[PDB]
Amino acid sequence: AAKKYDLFGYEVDTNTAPWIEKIKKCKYYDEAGEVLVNMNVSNCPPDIATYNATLQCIYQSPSKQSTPVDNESKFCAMMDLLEEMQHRNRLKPNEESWTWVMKECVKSGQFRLGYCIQQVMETECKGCPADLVKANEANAQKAKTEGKEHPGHLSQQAGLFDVKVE
Amino acid sequence: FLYKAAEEKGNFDNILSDFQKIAAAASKLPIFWERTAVVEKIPEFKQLSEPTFFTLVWMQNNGMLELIQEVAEVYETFVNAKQKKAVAKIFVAPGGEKNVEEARRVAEELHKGLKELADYTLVLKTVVDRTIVKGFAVELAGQYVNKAEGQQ
Amino acid sequence: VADHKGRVGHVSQVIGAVVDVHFADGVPPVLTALDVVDKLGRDEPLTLEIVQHLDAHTGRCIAMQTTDLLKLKAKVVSTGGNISVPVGRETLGRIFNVLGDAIDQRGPVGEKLRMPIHAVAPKLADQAAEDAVLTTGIKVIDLILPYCKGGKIGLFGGAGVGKTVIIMELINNVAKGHGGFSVFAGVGERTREGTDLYLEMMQSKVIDLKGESKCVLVYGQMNEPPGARARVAQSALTMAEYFRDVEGQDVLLFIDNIFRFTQANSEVSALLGRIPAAVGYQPTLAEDLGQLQERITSTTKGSITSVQAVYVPADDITDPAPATTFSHLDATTVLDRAVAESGIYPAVNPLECASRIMDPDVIS
Amino acid sequence: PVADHKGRVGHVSQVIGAVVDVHFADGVPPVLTALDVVDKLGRDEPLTLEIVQHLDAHTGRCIAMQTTDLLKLKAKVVSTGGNISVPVGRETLGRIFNVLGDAIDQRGPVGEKLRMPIHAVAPKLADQAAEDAVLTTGIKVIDLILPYCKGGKIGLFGGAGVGKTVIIMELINNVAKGHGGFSVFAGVGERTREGTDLYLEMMQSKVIDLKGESKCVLVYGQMNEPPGARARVAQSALTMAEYFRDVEGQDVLLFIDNIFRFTQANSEVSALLGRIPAAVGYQPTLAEDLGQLQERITSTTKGSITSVQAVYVPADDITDPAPATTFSHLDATTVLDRAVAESGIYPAVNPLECASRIMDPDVIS
Amino acid sequence: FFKTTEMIGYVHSIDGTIATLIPAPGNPGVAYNTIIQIQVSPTTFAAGLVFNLEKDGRIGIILMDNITEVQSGQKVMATGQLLHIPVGAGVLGKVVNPLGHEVPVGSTLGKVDTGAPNIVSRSPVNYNLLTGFKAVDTMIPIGRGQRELIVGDRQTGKTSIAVSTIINQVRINQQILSKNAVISIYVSIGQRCSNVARIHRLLQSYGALRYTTVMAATAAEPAGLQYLAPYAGVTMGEYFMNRGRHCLCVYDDLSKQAVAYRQISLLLRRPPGREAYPGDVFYLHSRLLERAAMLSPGKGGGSVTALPIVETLSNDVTAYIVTNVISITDGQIYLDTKLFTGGQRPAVNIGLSVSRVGSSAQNAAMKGVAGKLKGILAEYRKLAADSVGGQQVQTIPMIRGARFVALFNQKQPSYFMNAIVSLYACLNGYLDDVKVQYVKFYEYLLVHRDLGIMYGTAKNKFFYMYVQELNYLIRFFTLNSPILHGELEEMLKQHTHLFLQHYQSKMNAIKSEKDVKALKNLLYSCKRAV
Amino acid sequence: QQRTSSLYNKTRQFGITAALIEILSAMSSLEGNAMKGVRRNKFWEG
Ligand SMILES: Nc1ncnc2c1ncn2[C@@H]1O[C@H](COP(=O)(O)OP(=O)(O)OP(=O)(O)O)[C@@H](O)[C@H]1O
Ligand SMILES: Nc1ncnc2c1ncn2[C@@H]1O[C@H](COP(=O)(O)OP(=O)(O)O)[C@@H](O)[C@H]1O
Ligand SMILES: [Mg+2]
Ligand SMILES: [Mg+2]
Numbered sequence A: 001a002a003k004k005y006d007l008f009g010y011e012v013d014t015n016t017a018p019w020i021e022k023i024k025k026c027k028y029y030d031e032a033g034e035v036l037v038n039m040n041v042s043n044c045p046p047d048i049a050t051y052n053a054t055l056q057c058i059y060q061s062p063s064k065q066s067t068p069v070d071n072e073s074k075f076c077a078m079m080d081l082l083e084e085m086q087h088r089n090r091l092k093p094n095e096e097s098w099t100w101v102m103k104e105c106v107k108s109g110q111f112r113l114g115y116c117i118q119q120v121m122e123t124e125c126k127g128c129p130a131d132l133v134k135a136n137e138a139n140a141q142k143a144k145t146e147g148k149e150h151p152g153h154l155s156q157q158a159g160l161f162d163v164k165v166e
Numbered sequence B: 001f002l003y004k005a006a007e008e009k010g011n012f013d014n015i016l017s018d019f020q021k022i023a024a025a026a027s028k029l030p031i032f033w034e035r036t037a038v039v040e041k042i043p044e045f046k047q048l049s050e051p052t053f054f055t056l057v058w059m060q061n062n063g064m065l066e067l068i069q070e071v072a073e074v075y076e077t078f079v080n081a082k083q084k085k086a087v088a089k090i091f092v093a094p095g096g097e098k099n100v101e102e103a104r105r106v107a108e109e110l111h112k113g114l115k116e117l118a119d120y121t122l123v124l125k126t127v128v129d130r131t132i133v134k135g136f137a138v139e140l141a142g143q144y145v146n147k148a149e150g151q152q
Numbered sequence C: 001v002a003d004h005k006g007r008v009g010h011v012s013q014v015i016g017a018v019v020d021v022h023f024a025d026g027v028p029p030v031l032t033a034l035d036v037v038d039k040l041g042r043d044e045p046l047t048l049e050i051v052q053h054l055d056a057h058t059g060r061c062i063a064m065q066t067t068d069l070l071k072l073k074a075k076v077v078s079t080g081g082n083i084s085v086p087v088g089r090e091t092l093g094r095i096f097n098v099l100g101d102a103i104d105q106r107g108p109v110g111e112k113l114r115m116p117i118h119a120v121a122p123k124l125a126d127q128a129a130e131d132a133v134l135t136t137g138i139k140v141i142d143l144i145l146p147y148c149k150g151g152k153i154g155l156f157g158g159a160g161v162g163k164t165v166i167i168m169e170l171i172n173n174v175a176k177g178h179g180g181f182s183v184f185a186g187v188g189e190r191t192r193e194g195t196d197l198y199l200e201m202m203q204s205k206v207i208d209l210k211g212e213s214k215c216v217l218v219y220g221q222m223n224e225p226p227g228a229r230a231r232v233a234q235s236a237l238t239m240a241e242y243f244r245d246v247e248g249q250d251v252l253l254f255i256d257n258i259f260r261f262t263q264a265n266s267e268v269s270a271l272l273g274r275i276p277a278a279v280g281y282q283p284t285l286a287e288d289l290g291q292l293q294e295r296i297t298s299t300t301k302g303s304i305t306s307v308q309a310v311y312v313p314a315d316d317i318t319d320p321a322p323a324t325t326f327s328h329l330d331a332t333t334v335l336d337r338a339v340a341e342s343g344i345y346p347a348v349n350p351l352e353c354a355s356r357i358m359d360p361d362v363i364s
Numbered sequence D: 001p002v003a004d005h006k007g008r009v010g011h012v013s014q015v016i017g018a019v020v021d022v023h024f025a026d027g028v029p030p031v032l033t034a035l036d037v038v039d040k041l042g043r044d045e046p047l048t049l050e051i052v053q054h055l056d057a058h059t060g061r062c063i064a065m066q067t068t069d070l071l072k073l074k075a076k077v078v079s080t081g082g083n084i085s086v087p088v089g090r091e092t093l094g095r096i097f098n099v100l101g102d103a104i105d106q107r108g109p110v111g112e113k114l115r116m117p118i119h120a121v122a123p124k125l126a127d128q129a130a131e132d133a134v135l136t137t138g139i140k141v142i143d144l145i146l147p148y149c150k151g152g153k154i155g156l157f158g159g160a161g162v163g164k165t166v167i168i169m170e171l172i173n174n175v176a177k178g179h180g181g182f183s184v185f186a187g188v189g190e191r192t193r194e195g196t197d198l199y200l201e202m203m204q205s206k207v208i209d210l211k212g213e214s215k216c217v218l219v220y221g222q223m224n225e226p227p228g229a230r231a232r233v234a235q236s237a238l239t240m241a242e243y244f245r246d247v248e249g250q251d252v253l254l255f256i257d258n259i260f261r262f263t264q265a266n267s268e269v270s271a272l273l274g275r276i277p278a279a280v281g282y283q284p285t286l287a288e289d290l291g292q293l294q295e296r297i298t299s300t301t302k303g304s305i306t307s308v309q310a311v312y313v314p315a316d317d318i319t320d321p322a323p324a325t326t327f328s329h330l331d332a333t334t335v336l337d338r339a340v341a342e343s344g345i346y347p348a349v350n351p352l353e354c355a356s357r358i359m360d361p362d363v364i365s
Numbered sequence E: 001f002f003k004t005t006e007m008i009g010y011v012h013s014i015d016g017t018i019a020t021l022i023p024a025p026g027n028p029g030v031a032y033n034t035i036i037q038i039q040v041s042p043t044t045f046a047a048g049l050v051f052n053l054e055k056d057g058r059i060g061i062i063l064m065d066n067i068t069e070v071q072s073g074q075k076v077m078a079t080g081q082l083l084h085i086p087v088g089a090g091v092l093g094k095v096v097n098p099l100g101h102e103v104p105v106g107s108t109l110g111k112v113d114t115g116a117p118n119i120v121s122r123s124p125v126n127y128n129l130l131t132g133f134k135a136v137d138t139m140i141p142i143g144r145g146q147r148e149l150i151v152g153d154r155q156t157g158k159t160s161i162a163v164s165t166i167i168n169q170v171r172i173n174q175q176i177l178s179k180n181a182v183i184s185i186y187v188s189i190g191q192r193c194s195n196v197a198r199i200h201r202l203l204q205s206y207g208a209l210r211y212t213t214v215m216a217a218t219a220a221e222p223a224g225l226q227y228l229a230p231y232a233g234v235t236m237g238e239y240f241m242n243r244g245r246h247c248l249c250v251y252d253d254l255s256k257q258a259v260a261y262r263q264i265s266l267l268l269r270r271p272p273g274r275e276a277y278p279g280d281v282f283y284l285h286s287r288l289l290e291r292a293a294m295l296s297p298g299k300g301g302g303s304v305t306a307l308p309i310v311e312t313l314s315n316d317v318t319a320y321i322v323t324n325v326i327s328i329t330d331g332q333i334y335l336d337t338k339l340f341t342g343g344q345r346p347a348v349n350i351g352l353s354v355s356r357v358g359s360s361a362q363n364a365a366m367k368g369v370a371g372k373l374k375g376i377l378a379e380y381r382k383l384a385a386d387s388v389g390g391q392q393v394q395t396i397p398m399i400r401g402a403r404f405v406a407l408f409n410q411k412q413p414s415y416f417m418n419a420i421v422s423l424y425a426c427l428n429g430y431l432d433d434v435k436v437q438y439v440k441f442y443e444y445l446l447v448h449r450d451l452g453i454m455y456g457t458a459k460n461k462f463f464y465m466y467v468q469e470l471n472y473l474i475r476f477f478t479l480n481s482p483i484l485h486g487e488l489e490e491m492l493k494q495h496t497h498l499f500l501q502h503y504q505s506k507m508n509a510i511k512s513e514k515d516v517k518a519l520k521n522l523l524y525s526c527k528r529a530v
Numbered sequence F: 001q002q003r004t005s006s007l008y009n010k011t012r013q014f015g016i017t018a019a020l021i022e023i024l025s026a027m028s029s030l031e032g033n034a035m036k037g038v039r040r041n042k043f044w045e046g
Helices: A017-025 A029-042 A048-060 A074-089 A095-108 A111-123 A130-146 B002-009 B013-028 B050-062 B065-083 B101-113 C139-143 C163-176 C191-204 C226-246 C259-272 C285-293 C320-328 C337-342 D140-144 D164-176 D192-205 D227-248 D260-273 D286-296 D321-327 D338-342 E134-139 E158-175 E193-206 E223-241 E254-267 E281-289 E320-328 E337-342 E364-389 E396-408 E416-428 E436-448 E470-476 E485-509 E515-529 F002-032
Strands: B085-092 B121-128 B132-140 B143-150 C008-015 C018-022 C032-035 C047-053 C058-063 C075-082 C084-086 C114-116 C152-156 C182-189 C215-221 C250-256 C303-309 C331-334 D009-016 D019-023 D034-037 D048-054 D059-064 D076-079 D085-087 D115-117 D153-158 D183-188 D216-221 D251-257 D304-312 D332-335 E005-015 E018-023 E035-039 E046-053 E059-063 E075-078 E084-087 E108-111 E149-152 E182-189 E212-217 E246-252 E303-311 E332-334
Touching: A017 A029, A017 A048, A029 A048, A048 A074, A048 A095, A074 A095, A074 E158, A074 E470, A095 A111, A095 A130, A111 A130, B002 B013, B002 B050, B002 B065, B013 B050, B013 B065, B050 B065, B065 B085, B085 B101, B101 B121, B101 B132, B101 B143, C018 C047, C047 C259, C058 C226, C058 C259, C075 C084, C084 C226, C114 C226, C152 C320, C163 C182, C163 C191, C163 C250, C163 C303, C182 C191, C182 C226, C182 C259, C191 C215, C215 C226, C226 C250, C226 C259, C226 C285, C226 C303, C259 C285, C259 C320, C259 E281, C285 C320, D019 D048, D019 D260, D059 D227, D085 D227, D115 D227, D153 D164, D153 D321, D164 D183, D164 D192, D164 D251, D164 D304, D183 D192, D183 D227, D192 D216, D216 D227, D227 D251, D227 D260, D227 D286, D227 D304, D260 D286, D260 D304, D260 D321, D286 D321, D286 E254, D304 D321, E005 E035, E035 E059, E046 E223, E059 E223, E084 E223, E108 E223, E134 E364, E134 E396, E134 E416, E149 E158, E149 E320, E158 E182, E158 E193, E158 E246, E158 E303, E182 E193, E182 E223, E193 E212, E212 E223, E223 E246, E223 E254, E223 E281, E223 E303, E254 E281, E254 E303, E254 E320, E281 E320, E303 E320, E364 E396, E364 E416, E364 E470, E396 E416, E396 E436, E416 E436, E416 E470, E416 E485, E436 E485, E436 E515
Parallel strands: B085 B121, C152 C303, C152 C331, C182 C215, C182 C250, C250 C303, D153 D304, D153 D332, D183 D216, D183 D251, D251 D304, E149 E303, E149 E332, E182 E212, E182 E246, E246 E303
Antiparallel strands: B085 B132, B132 B143, B143 E005, C008 C018, C008 C075, C008 E046, C018 C058, C032 C047, C032 C075, C047 C058, C084 C114, D009 D019, D009 D076, D019 D059, D034 D048, D034 D076, D048 D059, D048 E005, D085 D115, E005 E018, E005 E075, E018 E059, E035 E046, E035 E075, E046 E059, E084 E108
């Protein structure tokens, strides 16, 4: 509706619907990242809707790539995307992105990250979804009952000379 | 200088004959003759054409008597260009230039491909290349074709 | 042969950025500009500047860009004169290279005239008849080390002391007061710093794309070859001279740096093969610096003040380049980080600062 | 196989110092080619030349492994059919050789079943061995601060009067006598008296067993010898070591004293060859010339080479380009200090300036 | 339809690694800085580059391979094009020559020589690049698109710094998208093939080969190859830079490249200058480094970071090359032999090290922490200057500065979360009662393991050390925020109280011949572990 | 300290100049021992 000028005053393409459609049609969120790179090359800066679509693609995607990648984390990828959006583009995340993050945390079972995201949503957005909060609490209680509340070597008692510093 | 002198008379083959005489004289002459040689006192060169003798004296005065071969090559190039003859170098294994039909047909194909040489007539010059043991190579107007094999 | 424009020549020798040109009709004059018209699959135009004549037909030239993909016998066309640069108020708020071509990708210049790079310095009779003072609007500068119209100000200090801030404030104050534009010249300076300077100027509106711009920019970056790094300053000085004469104004020529200009000239001399003088600087150091500085003076028409940033190698003012630069400098301006750390802005050390018009003869 | 240039004939054209120009009507031989002068010239010794440059298709420029006395123009020279070759194998054990590989000990003919050219291509990246094993030299400072690595490279940087030669002899006595692998010594541009003393010490220690079986070989090109020999002697010894490494599969020791003479000799002839001086007077090609040799001196998959090189620092100025380049082609470096020597401390070693690659907890205790 | 190649002439002179060419009469000719093949054999060729074009028609050539196979009179052909090398994602994890050939170990084409971005194509440096070292990340910010020199002396860890920087990005690349991942290009010049092999093995062991490639021009290679390698590396980086991705080009080192260029020029009879380096050395380095930039958003957003390495002889920083490179670069990192021997590894000298880019390249939390850390270190240095010959007075700035100095010691890169947490603790004074010699053990216990769980005094919910995914949360929100501030302070208080109560008391109580040795070994192990 | 700094600067300048002079002398020798060119004169004019 309104033109946006770049750092040097040159205008940019605000029509990002085709790229959003491509992102939604992607399979692995690395492809969505590639699409964002292509948008940047083509001078079509991503918008809040584009970032939220990328987050949805991350959440709904099977994995980072067709082949497994060690220590991959949808939560880490989405947090990096949020940092890029807020800091290097001056765009405030909306409640949709935080809800997607909380959904990913619940699906993964990371109850601590769920608690942190709940606090963040309460602080900035207008609260955290009750369903997600309850799911996180249920996962935490299940872990507590099963005995996976905390790592094992941490619970293990070690003296001053017993710590096996590698 | 040699080309202009030859053009003034319309004859050029005399220059090439003089160069052949000079090559024979150099072969007969002792080692490192050009270092202290006097063309006037040299008996063989006394039979050369006036332009050739003048150029030899000039090169002797300047001390540049080792450039005869390159000067002859350049003069031959000028003569070939003037007469509209394109010379193709056929590099052949050391010993035996009988297998030249393939080189000739390749040179003809290259001449046909080179539209700028259509007016010129194709000529062949055989040169021994110690590097190659078998086959041959063809060069024409800078276009080089490799069809030879070396030692393994 | 008075009008050599359009004269054709053939490239005969190439070594690095040094090119030999053969003209059948006779070599053009010195400092002449040539262009390589042949299509060599080059992504950028290639132009050369004549510096020596080997013989009647052969001339030696230096390239302002890389000589890649250049073959012997390549065609060359003279431009009919020295290097040309656009002039006028159209240049305001625009970035230029040595060749007087905009690189901001912000439309054509629309210049109404072009002027040569190498122009003789003002004669003795054209000099100002009285020494004057430049009102910068800054208490410290206008009190302790007042500047002189048509003079040179040697600025010492790196980053973290607001050198760009001082430059922008000086331009703004000059425009608000004496009413004269400014010309900035980045010689052998970092591309990142040039970009940051352009962005800051646009933010401050001294260079307003949609409005009046008080400053012109000329940039020969370190990526550029020594010839361009040397001639960019002369181009900026040509623009300043046009403003001084045609418009009768008080212009400010900022240079960053002059040491880079000296280094580029030294590299050019080395490439041409002239044996280096002491340290390694070219023997023509003083003459080259003079041909630039003497063009900076106060005339009966207008004034061209200069502010030249100076870098002192090894912190030795005894070095020939800074010594020769000081011999031409009129006043000095020092920036110290300790002052900024204490919290005084602008960070200036008046004890170290000095000037020559600090005499009741000129000032009150 | 037989090189086509074997027996090729050339004539001497220009002579300047140790530099001689040779013209061949048929064609200039390949670079690194070895030529011998046929004319008697009244010389007590034969004259040998090595090609290093080509001035045209027919002309070449060469240096002389020996003196150029009684040398005339138009002198007849004949190619040897290949580069300079040296005998190899166990038949050389306990023997003394020169740059040309001819026995100089006056101890009888040597049975050579194979000659190898001095010039060889350095091993590639894939042909390298990852060995991290400490070595015990019996010296406290060396074994503590800068431990050596088996199959690695060691430099002894020092001036004059600091103890480089003494330390080399001490290491030889400590190690080479009991080391299973053989040893090769390179007396490059050093004192013939020191070489003789080393030979006598080896004979006393029975390393060189004339009646029995020896364990070391010597190659001596000294200061009296011309720069060509002083340069190519090290490469000849390195070829010997390379044969012992590859064709046999040993862990061979290689002591060199001193490498700096190689660069000095090359600089003596750079200008005559027609190369401008670069810095301090050294030849521009110093980096490549030293790097080729240093890379050839390395441990491979087949065998291992432990190299110890003495390095001379002119005026005790470590900033000199030759030592500066040498620093990067070594695993361990021992720097000597004239002040430490004056203080009576021997060996005069500056641990602060010393360094070692294997000084990591993973390798050593 | 034959395979025609333009023949230009024959070889006239050979001088080491270079050569001269005489053109055959009436030939098309060749351009400048182009590639040619010397026909040593009918099926084998040697690569060469054009460098001079004399008036007489003779040409100057720099050899690149099969030099020993070159002899006068051999034939020559010209490709007629500049030097293009393979580039793409299919090159990573491989060792390659500047000419593109792959070196045995046990996608498209890019020009080596390309112009740098203009003014309008660049953007201010904001994105941070992490080397994994606290000293660098705090006192000497490094941002993508920056050209930061590493100047030191022999045996000071210069190459180790860059290797650790490359390695520290492996985890980030694994976690975050490939879009923001960093692709590493390590260039070895005039170094030993053995050192190259060791580096390759280290990278393979740490798993960095996936996102890293190596360009080798080891000694025994021609000076032309050594001189060309860095430009090929920059081209490989630009391939990703123009495609909206971030690259890190490491050079080791420009000194040998300068030496090779000097050798070539002197062999080719070009006018020399200071130290015999011709006048084009500065232009060479400038055009090599200016290709590193932070592209504007409309150009793709990609970036290239330059980490050239330089060696100074006996701290002679006034050398021509060092001066030129320092003036060119956007800041320097100075390594000191004195500190290296004293134990500060890395041996960075903050006074001699600077980053012209500034704090704009630091993350928000790191920015805030550094804002105070820099002043604290300045005060500690000022007090230590006077404390040379007098008893010290244990003030808060001195204590915190000493603890920071002890923390800066490290062997391997440290994860951002652990580094920032430790720095915040030291800044806020949770270590004020901790001993300097035990800071490393304290940090090891705080990072690798935990004490709250062990002693059954856990009260936080989400702020725990073993949750390595909190790094991105910390990057998004500063530590001085209500979201994490309370949990962080509680955890630090608990850990400090437990340590002082249990471990430090025993340490102080140690009185024996074996317990002291065991404690010393433990301290050193922690020091070189974290 | 000031005097030593002055001497140090003087010494570095002198060293640089001396090295340049030596290299230039070598280049002058090499080039001037090969400077040549055909002379267009009357050799017959004896
Ligand atoms: N942070 C560090 N802590 C401890 N040791 C280190 C550290 N960084 C490097 N080292 C060690 O220092 C030694 C020299 O490292 P490196 O080769 O990187 O230094 P350099 O300055 O590049 O030296 P060179 O001239 O040999 O390349 C190695 O043993 C290495 O393990
Ligand atoms: N172990 C040692 N103990 C005492 N003096 C020694 C020792 N090693 C060397 N020196 C001193 O150094 C001299 C030998 O120096 P050397 O290594 O031969 O010098 P260069 O390295 O110049 O060949 C001896 O004459 C003695 O003065
Ligand atoms: Mg000795
Ligand atoms: Mg290193």
